[PDB]
Amino acid sequence: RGSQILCVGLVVLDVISLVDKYPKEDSEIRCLSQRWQRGGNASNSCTVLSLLGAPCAFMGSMAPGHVADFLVADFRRRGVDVSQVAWQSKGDTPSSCCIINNSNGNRTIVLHDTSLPDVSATDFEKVDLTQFKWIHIEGRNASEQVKMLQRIDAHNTRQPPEQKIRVSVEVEKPREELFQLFGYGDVVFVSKDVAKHLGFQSAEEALRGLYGRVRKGAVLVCAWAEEGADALGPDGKLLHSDAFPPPRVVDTLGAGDTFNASVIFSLSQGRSVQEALRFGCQVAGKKCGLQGFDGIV
């Protein structure tokens, strides 16, 4: 069957305040405007995949309430298949305050991480893999997710190399539990932040450094903000793309997630890595000159 891309990670309620300068501690400013957004990484990518025309599904934990009710209404307005959601009985829907600096698009996030339990190999074991051509996993609970990945590798072995499910991993946080995911998946996304918190000061360094850790045959991608992004495949040849900066950067909240969704969409449509990188930077760049996600397509 396999027409859908699945993203596994967080859905968070983003309570957003657009200010024109980042307030100095102990001071007080008035925001230009405010809004609510369905956020969290896997969730954001689903938004982006949807907008690009790719049928997709989200999978993460949500706790029933008025909050979950809004997040789902939004998922459904987008056409994001939520049927894979691991509903919880104990815990709250995470949320966060996001101050977005309108003069330069900087975004500052205060996350309220609830009790809410992550999805587990248990919940995942319960999933119909034959619906998906691509599966992307937001690194969080490594122990449990590695399990999930193996269930997919093991599912690929019993498949025509034609009908194999493509797998991508994001390692966005500098915490060590996650460095095992490097690891699995055809495509591995590592953030500038991780890369720096590990000694590296350029996208090309990070890639020469970390290529050691990836499933043989994998592509490692590392974006570097206004500097574009680089990728490195089995052949050893470094690939680069210049960023596409909008003329006014006004909102970079979910720029990384836009990059990733875009890279995945492109690879999932047959494109070269070079083309998918370029496209990643192109949509990310365009989103930086917009409030939210509407208007990138």
Ligand X SMILES: Cc1ccccc1Nc1nc(N2CCNCC2)nc2c(NCC3CC3)ncnc12
* Residue 27, contacted partner among a second copy, ligand X, none, CB below 5-8 A by kind: a second copy
Out of 71, 229, 232, 273, point to the residue binding ligand X (CB under 6 A).
229
Q: What is the nearest approach in angstroms of a second copy to the Cβ of residue 35? A: 8
Binding residues for a second copy restricted to 91-120, rule: CB under 8 A: 92, 95, 97, 99, 101, 106-115
Supply 81's token pair: 């298949």
Q: What is the nearest approach in angstroms of ligand X to the Cβ of residue 44? A: 11
* Residue 31, contacted partner among ligand X, a second copy, none, CB below 5-8 A by kind: a second copy
Those residues whose C-beta lies under 8 Å from the C-beta of residue 70, and which sit 6 or more positions away, are 13, 36, 38
Q: In what order do the strands lie in the sheet with 56-59?
A: 56-59, 4-8, 132-138, 166-171, 187-190, 219-223, 229-232, 238-241
Supply 57's token pair: 């599904």
* Residue 288, contacted partner among a second copy, ligand X, none, CB below 5-8 A by kind: ligand X
d(CA 42, CA 38): 11
Binding residues for a second copy restricted to 26-55, rule: CB under 8 A: 26-36
Q: Which is nearer to ligand X, 124 or 259 (CB)?
A: 259
* Residue 180, contacted partner among ligand X, a second copy, none, CB below 5-8 A by kind: none
248 binds a second copy (CB under 8 A): no
Burial of 122 (C-beta count, 10 Å sphere; 0-12/13-18/19+): exposed
d(CA 78, CA 63): 20
Q: Which is nearer to ligand X, 73 or 238 (CB)?
A: 238
Out of 54, 99, 288, 296, point to the residue binding ligand X (CB under 6 A).
288
Does the CA dihedral 204-208-210-214 come out positive or negative? positive
Q: Is 276 helix (H, G, I), strand (E, B) or coil?
A: helix
Q: Count CA atoms closer than 13 A to 150's CA, side-chain side.
A: 10
How many Cβ atoms from other residues are within 10 Å of residue 295's Cβ?
A: 11
List the Cα angle 164/169/170 in 5-degree steps: 160
277 binds ligand X (CB under 6 A): no
Q: Which positions from 232 to 261 touch ligand X by CB under 6 A, shown as an x/- string?
A: -----------xxx---x--x--xx--x--
Q: Which is nearer to ligand X, 67 or 284 (CB)?
A: 284
226 binds ligand X (CB under 6 A): yes
User: What residue type is assigned to position 121 of the chain?
Assistant: A
Total binding residues toward ligand X, as defined by CB under 6 A: 18
- Contact between residue 93 and residue 66 where contact means Cβ atoms under 8 Å apart: no
Interface ranges with a second copy (CB under 8 A): 15, 17, 19, 22-36, 66-67, 69-70, 92, 95, 97, 99, 101, 106-115
Interface ranges with ligand X (CB under 6 A): 26, 223, 225-226, 228-229, 243-245, 249, 252, 255-256, 259, 281, 284-285, 288
